[PDB]
Every structure is written in C-alpha cells, then in structure tokens.
Amino acid sequence: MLKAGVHFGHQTRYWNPKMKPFIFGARNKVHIINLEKTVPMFNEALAELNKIASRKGKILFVGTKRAASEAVKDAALSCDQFFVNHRWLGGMLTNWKTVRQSIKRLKDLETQSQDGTFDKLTKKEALMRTRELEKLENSLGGIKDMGGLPDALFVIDADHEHIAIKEANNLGIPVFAIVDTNSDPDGVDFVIPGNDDAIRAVTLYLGAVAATVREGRS
Amino acid sequence: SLSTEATAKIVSEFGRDANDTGSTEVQVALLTAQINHLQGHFAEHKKDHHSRRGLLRMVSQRRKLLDYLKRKDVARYTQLIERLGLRR
Amino acid sequence: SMQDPIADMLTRIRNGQAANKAAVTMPSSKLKVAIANVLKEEGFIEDFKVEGDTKPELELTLKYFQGKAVVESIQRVSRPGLRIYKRKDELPKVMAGLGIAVVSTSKGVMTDRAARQAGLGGEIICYVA
RNA sequence: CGUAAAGCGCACGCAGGCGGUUUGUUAAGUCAGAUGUGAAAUCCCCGGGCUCAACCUGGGAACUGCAUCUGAUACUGGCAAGCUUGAGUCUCGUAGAGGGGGGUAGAAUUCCAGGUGUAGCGGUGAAAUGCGUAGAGAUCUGGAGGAAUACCGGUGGCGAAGGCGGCCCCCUGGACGAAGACUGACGCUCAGGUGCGAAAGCGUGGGGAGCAAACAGGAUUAGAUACCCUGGUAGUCCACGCCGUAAACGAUGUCGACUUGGAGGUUGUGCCCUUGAGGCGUGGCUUCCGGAGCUAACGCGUUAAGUCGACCGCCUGGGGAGUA
Ligand SMILES: [Mg+2]
Ligand SMILES: [Mg+2]
Ligand SMILES: [Mg+2]
Ligand SMILES: [Mg+2]
Ligand SMILES: [Mg+2]
Ligand SMILES: [Mg+2]
Ligand SMILES: [Mg+2]
Ligand SMILES: [Mg+2]
Ligand SMILES: [Mg+2]
Ligand SMILES: [Mg+2]
Ligand SMILES: [Mg+2]
Ligand SMILES: [Mg+2]
Ligand SMILES: [Mg+2]
Ligand SMILES: [Mg+2]
Ligand SMILES: [Mg+2]
Ligand SMILES: [Mg+2]
Ligand SMILES: [Mg+2]
Ligand SMILES: [Mg+2]
Ligand SMILES: [Mg+2]
Ligand SMILES: [Mg+2]
Ligand SMILES: [Mg+2]
Ligand SMILES: [Mg+2]
C-alpha cells in the first residue's frame, strides 16, 4: 500500500518503453509509478541488502546528482559503508589498480594537512595544496577507506549513473537501483521503480536502506 | 459518374430485387452503362490519357466479372450477354 | 495476398517470441490447431485455445524457461512454391534428435519420431528446435 | 541486387506460377506393403588361393528407377455444396497544382506613335564592342503582341510513373471517412503483348515578347574554337503526327502478414455541457529521430535495408563494350 508519501512517479513522454509493467499512468500527461508493484520489490531488495550487510560487505551508494549528494553524506554515511556523491570518474572499479594510487595520494595529503608539511613554503604553494586536497576529497571521498572491490552497488538513478552500473555488470557485482520511468533496466539485478528526483522520496529510500544496514551481523 | 437516378434504375432492373447492388449482373450492368457513356467523352478530347486509365480499369473489371460468371453459371452468363449487348 | 497461412502462424510465433509477448493470436484453422496441438504436447508452448464460431480465433501461450525463449528456431520446410515429401526412411531429424520436425502423415499430423515409429512418411510441415 | 555487378521509367494484362475458410466425395500427387523387372562384371560387406599384396573368387547388399495389385486419407489436386474475414457494388459526404476543352484578369519585358528634356546611356574586376546630338538614356500618354502566373507557398497537396500552381465555366479519373445493405474467393503475380512516358530532337502548318545552342564582334590569356560583355538564328509557345530515352533515383519490383517508442504536418470522423481556440477516442496519407534486429561499414529501423510467404526482373573480375 501507500507506505510512501506523495511522489506518485515522475517524467512524462521521455519514458523508456521497458518500464511499461511498472507504469500506472493517468493525471495531466504524467506517468504514475504503480506503488503496489514497487512495495514487494522494494522490500525484497531491502531484504537482500540486509543479507549482504549481515555478511558485512560494501554497498556503494552513488548519488552524484546534487540535491541527493549530501543525503549520502548524511546518516547514509553513518553505516560503515562507502559512497560517491560527486562525479563518478570512469574506471573507479573496472581498473581499481590506477585509482589505488589516487587514494594513496589522498591519504598522504590528509596526514600532511594537520601533522606534516602544510605551512612550509610560500602561501601560494599552501593554498594550491589545500585546493588540490579538497579536489580529491570531493572527487573520491568515503571510498578512501575501501581497500578492495565492493560486494554490491546502490544507485539513486539508473540512466544518470549508467557508467557505474556498466562497470559493476562488467565485474559481476550485484546492483540495486531506483529506476524512474525514463530510466533503463536490464543493467540492474534488483530494480526499484520509484521517483528518484524528489528530495523527500530519495531520503525515504536512503533512510530505509540505511536502517536495514544498521543491522549488521547483529 | 452515373447519376443517382440512373444507378438506381439499373440496380432495380438487373438485380433479383431492390438493394441488391452486389450481384454480378448489377455490377456488370453498371460498368457497361458507364463505359458506353464515356465513349462520347473520349470521342471528343481524345487526349485525356489520365481519365482513360480509369476507363481501362472499368473494362478490366468487367472482363474479370464476366469470366467469373461464365465459370459459375453459364445460363446466367449468356442471358446477361444478350441483354447488355456485349459480344463475348 | 495471403498465400501460406501455416508460414504466417510460424512467423507469428517467431516474432512474438522475439518480442517477449506472453501470447499470440491468429485466425484459426484445422491444420493450425493440429500443429498447435503437436507443439503443446512436445513442450514448446504452454497452451492453446479457440474462440468464436463464425470467425474462430486461435490463441497460443508462449513459453520462456529463463530470460530467453524456448522455441529457439522455427522454420517452414514444405511451402506452397515447393512442397517436400519424405519416405519413412528419409524422414529428417533436426539438430540430431533434439527438437522436432512436424510431419503430416496419412494418420494425422505428428512429429518425426512418432511417424518413424508408426512406419510411414508424409509431408514435412516445419522444423522446430 | 540502397552505395561493391545486379529492380525493367511506370502501369494494364493473356499464357504460366501460386491461392482464405467448413463439410462431403474421389484417390491423381503423397505415404505403406507386396509382385515383376532393374544382365554379368564393377563399387561396398562377410573367406580362401596364388609365400603376402596386387589379382582371381563364393554369398549378400546395392542398383536410390519403372510398371501393376492391394490399402491409408493428414496435406496438395479434381468434383459438389456452403461461409464471410480477402476482393468488389450501392447510399451520404470530404480535401486536392489529377486530366482534357473554352474564356478571362493584373503586374512586368519588348516594340510602335507622340510629349517634356539634354549629354550621355549600357556594361565589367577594369575595359571595349554597342546605343546617342538624325536627340538616346530618364519621364509621361496611347496602342500592338507573345509568354509566364509575385504574394498565398508550406521536408504542403494530387497523380502509376513522367508530372501537375492566376481566376471562371464545361466534360472527366482516382483516393479517403460514417453507418448499413449487397455478391460470395470473383484473389496476388505476370515472360510474350498492349498502353502511357521529362528535356532535347524530327515532319507539316501557325506564332514569336523574353531567353538563347550555332554564329558575329569586344575582352581575358602565353594561347582561349571557353568562362565574362554586346548582339543573335534554330528552339523554347500552339495543332496534329513521330521519337521512346534521363542521376526516368528512394540509385530500394509488386502483393500480404507480424514485430518496443518519441516529436510534427495534412485530411476525415464518434462521444463528452463548444458551456472560446477544450477533453477522450478512431481512420488515410506524410516528415524527422531512434529501440531490437539487420548490415562490410555507412546506415535502415512499423512508409525496414527486421521476421516470413507468392510471383516476376536482373548479376557472375576490369578493359575491349552496351561496342561490332
Ligand atoms: Mg466507381
Ligand atoms: Mg559507382
Ligand atoms: Mg551499382
Ligand atoms: Mg523503380
Ligand atoms: Mg500488375
Ligand atoms: Mg486451399
Ligand atoms: Mg494414388
Ligand atoms: Mg548387376
Ligand atoms: Mg589369404
Ligand atoms: Mg565378388
Ligand atoms: Mg480437398
Ligand atoms: Mg514485358
Ligand atoms: Mg519538347
Ligand atoms: Mg517543330
Ligand atoms: Mg515551323
Ligand atoms: Mg551570350
Ligand atoms: Mg535506361
Ligand atoms: Mg525525376
Ligand atoms: Mg528526387
Ligand atoms: Mg536503374
Ligand atoms: Mg532512423
Ligand atoms: Mg547500339
């Protein structure tokens, strides 16, 4: 039933025909996602994530879309998990070897930021170092303490994070996605039909997934 | 094309009854009436190739209908031939 | 114009199968029903039904085992332009026994396996694999 | 067989090929068995003898074919009777540069006559040929004649293709939509055959303003049988007759069925208070983008170059040659 609030889908004609089974369709030329259909799938996905969390694996929230980013740095960051709230640089997963050096550089500069060399040499070299540091922080943040490939991915949007989904499929990593009417399934192992634009709705998804992952191995 | 009054006259005079516009005799009679009427039009002008293509379609349709009737019921095929004046 | 209704039935199945349709629908006929019956008993389709009386309509329910379809390839053999008849000893077998060849024998439509057991040949309607 | 060679320029159509759906009958095709025949050798499968092998040899199998007899009746064919979904007829309307004939209107170019007025006009990259003091060019008035129809105008419309634009009348072809009635497979394709078929070209008789092959002169150039300039004949126009060809192209034959979507144009129609130019549907044609699939790739993609069926046309390395 309507456990959610009032989002009733999104999008209009930019609709992917593969979403037909999940569409209700009605008011003022806007597609209405069939909430009755998503509730069982959403619960089924929540259960699988709970199973993975009990196994103590990673889930990799990604919500590059602003107005959804911080909500992964919110209590979504709480759980001992990892996120990518900014541009997903191509190759973050399919070549972990090269990005390994980038995180190593990030780690070294974080230490230097408080204990090492941060004041020596001209203020100009100080400010470039800091702005370079924050560039690494916001580009690859929570992912810093990962140290290996994940065990699952959680994507707020599918057609907007297609690069991440494709890399996961290439490496055989399960993918759980919130697919809108405009988005494309078949790259996702567990589809969750639901609006991915509304701030209220996306928080609802992140809270529910956050809550089920709070319960780790127990 | 044939006038509404003219069309009704042939239909009632060749069909088994009124509103029997589909019978082969009615169809052949209607084509024959229009083919004969157009002979005057093409005697004059004589260069209206685009309209003559419509006339040839009438001739071809009538030939096919007549062939079907001859194969189906010879007796009706004949009686129609003399009534309308067609050679073969 | 419509020259080969049987090939029409076969391609309707093929296209609907590739489009992931749940069921396909078509005008009915004795021969179509006989062929559909053989497909059902061989496990290539779920079921079939006929409706209406003056214009009977035949509907087939297609089968999927996994994400992919069940009827891998369905091909017409004896077509109106060239009809194929085989003796008992020349009956073909598709992909080495796997899959069937629908054959219309003097005792009705049946598979190549069934016809070979009954010891009589006939017209090769189609191949299914 | 879009671009590598290959869809006839387009139609109509005889022979031919193929053909919706139900019942009965026949048993020609088809299928089953049997009989006769299918020479021997050879080839193939099972032993010996030449010491082995080659070679010789016993028996079988095979000779895939033909004829006859006896059966089977699903499919194809024949015959008889049906059915309405393919095809067609009727009723009422809609849009359209569809076609043939006749009439007529306005703008403009040229020419002829006259007026006013005076030294240039025209042309080019620059010039010159050319026109002008015998009065041009410019400007105004009157008249003659031919050709084409600004704006509307629109990947707009119509036509089988070629193609078809002022307005009016006459004769005439097709397409589409609403609802109902009618016939009852009457269908699709089509070698040969027949018809239509841009422009140029040809014959006879007219007409002739503008434009303009050929031709003439002036330029450019090393040359310039050209590009540029000034003139200009056939032709372009009309009637009748011939020609039968084009990058006649969507470089894509016709017909039928099936297969996710998005945005437009144009033309019908049903219902809902039109309660303005609205809302919900349902047909025809048409443009652009794209999914699966297909493709060498480019790209095509419900108007397929996707998945299929029927028939036709055509290709088999380049040149010689679409020539003798
Ligand atoms: Mg008519
Ligand atoms: Mg070429
Ligand atoms: Mg070529
Ligand atoms: Mg063509
Ligand atoms: Mg034809
Ligand atoms: Mg039949
Ligand atoms: Mg027989
Ligand atoms: Mg012998
Ligand atoms: Mg021996
Ligand atoms: Mg021997
Ligand atoms: Mg029969
Ligand atoms: Mg010919
Ligand atoms: Mg000409
Ligand atoms: Mg002449
Ligand atoms: Mg002359
Ligand atoms: Mg000149
Ligand atoms: Mg040619
Ligand atoms: Mg052309
Ligand atoms: Mg063109
Ligand atoms: Mg050609
Ligand atoms: Mg396209
Ligand atoms: Mg020649």
Side-chain angles (χ1 to χ4, degrees), chain A, chain B residues 1-78 80-88, chain C:
Chain A
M1 293 180 183
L2 271 67
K3 290 172 67 172
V6 293
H7 67 74
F8 53 84
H10 209 159
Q11 329 293 4
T12 289
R13 95 270 263 270
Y14 321 90
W15 67 292
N16 198 333
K18 281 173 218 213
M19 295 280 85
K20 179 145 55 46
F22 313 143
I23 291 299
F24 211 56
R27 292 150 76 145
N28 64 7
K29 295 175 72 66
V30 168
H31 292 284
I32 307 307
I33 306 189
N34 176 24
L35 274 294
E36 190 277 331
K37 188 67 68 63
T38 187
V39 168
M41 293 180 183
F42 193 37
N43 288 354
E44 175 172 16
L46 267 293
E48 185 60 27
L49 281 172
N50 188 178
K51 153 64 165 306
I52 300 296
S54 67
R55 179 66 179 86
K56 184 55 66 177
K58 282 77 69 166
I59 51 173
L60 276 293
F61 303 82
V62 293
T64 298
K65 325 127 252 341
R66 92 179 37 206
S69 18
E70 21 51 60
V72 195
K73 235 195 321 105
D74 82 340
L77 111 112
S78 79
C79 188
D80 315 328
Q81 296 294 322
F82 306 81
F83 66 94
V84 176
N85 59 358
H86 293 96
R87 177 182 107 89
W88 171 283
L89 57 87
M92 209 168 323
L93 298 176
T94 182
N95 53 329
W96 183 248
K97 303 184 290 298
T98 312
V99 181
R100 187 179 296 140
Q101 287 82 16
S102 293
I103 62 170
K104 184 178 184 293
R105 193 82 165 112
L106 179 57
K107 294 259 194 52
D108 292 19
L109 270 48
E110 293 179 353
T111 72
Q112 283 183 5
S113 178
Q114 60 266 7
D115 79 348
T117 300
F118 68 106
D119 285 331
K120 274 68 66 168
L121 183 62
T122 54
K123 166 73 184 301
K124 197 165 179 194
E125 190 277 331
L127 61 83
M128 59 81 69
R129 178 57 43 72
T130 62
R131 66 181 294 276
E132 190 277 331
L133 174 60
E134 61 86 20
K135 193 177 228 189
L136 289 176
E137 294 293 328
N138 68 331
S139 178
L140 71 167
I143 195 71
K144 55 184 297 320
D145 289 328
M146 164 172 280
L149 298 178
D151 304 330
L153 268 76
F154 198 80
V155 305
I156 304 302
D157 179 294
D159 70 354
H160 187 277
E161 304 298 331
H162 58 92
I163 297 170
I165 288 155
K166 198 158 165 306
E167 288 191 352
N169 286 291
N170 180 308
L171 279 172
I173 307 196
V175 176
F176 312 77
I178 297 89
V179 296
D180 211 352
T181 78
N182 69 359
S183 281
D184 185 1
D186 310 337
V188 176
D189 292 288
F190 291 87
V191 301
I192 294 153
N195 181 356
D196 55 1
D197 291 331
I199 185 68
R200 196 271 308 158
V202 64
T203 51
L204 191 158
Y205 303 130
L206 285 169
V209 66
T212 188
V213 72
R214 299 291 179 90
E215 190 277 331
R217 65 176 297 280
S218 297
Chain B
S1 306
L2 292 166
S3 59
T4 287
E5 293 82 3
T7 304
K9 184 178 184 293
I10 295 89
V11 168
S12 68
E13 190 276 331
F14 268 104
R16 80 186 148 65
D17 72 281
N19 80 352
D20 180 19
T21 68
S23 58
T24 295
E25 281 88 334
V26 171
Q27 261 162 7
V28 173
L30 291 165
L31 294 173
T32 308
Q34 183 66 41
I35 285 164
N36 293 345
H37 175 44
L38 277 169
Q39 293 303 331
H41 168 90
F42 285 116
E44 162 162 17
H45 303 120
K46 186 183 287 185
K47 186 180 289 293
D48 198 2
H49 301 304
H50 289 68
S51 311
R52 209 188 309 273
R53 187 169 176 269
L55 172 72
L56 265 295
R57 184 177 178 179
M58 292 181 218
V59 167
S60 298
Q61 264 189 66
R62 184 179 74 188
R63 180 72 272 163
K64 290 181 181 180
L65 283 173
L66 279 167
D67 278 324
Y68 163 74
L69 189 55
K70 182 184 192 308
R71 194 208 322 139
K72 205 70 199 283
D73 189 358
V74 179
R76 305 167 45 199
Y77 163 68
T78 56
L80 184 64
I81 286 294
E82 293 83 3
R83 283 186 60 180
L84 281 172
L86 279 2
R87 297 187 292 122
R88 120 209 139 87
Chain C
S1 65
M2 178 63 38
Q3 311 270 318
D4 194 18
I6 298 306
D8 189 34
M9 162 168 154
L10 269 44
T11 187
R12 276 183 195 254
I13 288 167
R14 212 193 294 107
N15 298 347
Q17 200 83 48
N20 288 320
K21 306 295 289 298
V24 299
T25 304
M26 65 184 73
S28 171
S29 175
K30 291 191 294 184
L31 196 55
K32 290 191 209 175
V33 164
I35 297 165
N37 179 256
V38 167
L39 291 180
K40 180 178 177 177
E41 73 181 1
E42 286 310 299
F44 285 108
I45 58 176
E46 294 293 328
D47 206 343
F48 67 93
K49 117 261 278 324
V50 187
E51 333 269 54
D53 63 358
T54 187
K55 269 142 73 174
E57 183 65 26
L58 168 72
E59 172 198 296
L60 282 66
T61 300
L62 307 174
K63 188 189 282 190
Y64 306 85
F65 182 52
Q66 297 294 321
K68 65 178 72 66
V70 166
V71 59
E72 186 162 42
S73 55
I74 183 168
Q75 179 193 140
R76 179 74 148 124
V77 180
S78 172
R79 44 187 190 82
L82 173 63
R83 301 211 169 270
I84 305 294
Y85 305 109
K86 289 319 192 182
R87 312 263 294 290
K88 161 182 68 172
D89 291 331
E90 313 158 359
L91 286 182
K93 61 178 72 175
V94 308
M95 64 162 52
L98 321 184
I100 67 176
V102 182
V103 57
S104 178
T105 81
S106 174
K107 293 297 185 184
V109 171
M110 61 181 73
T111 65
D112 52 331
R113 211 180 174 137
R116 193 172 293 110
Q117 293 179 356
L120 72 173
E123 178 172 335
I124 313 302
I125 301 296
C126 68
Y127 292 165
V128 187

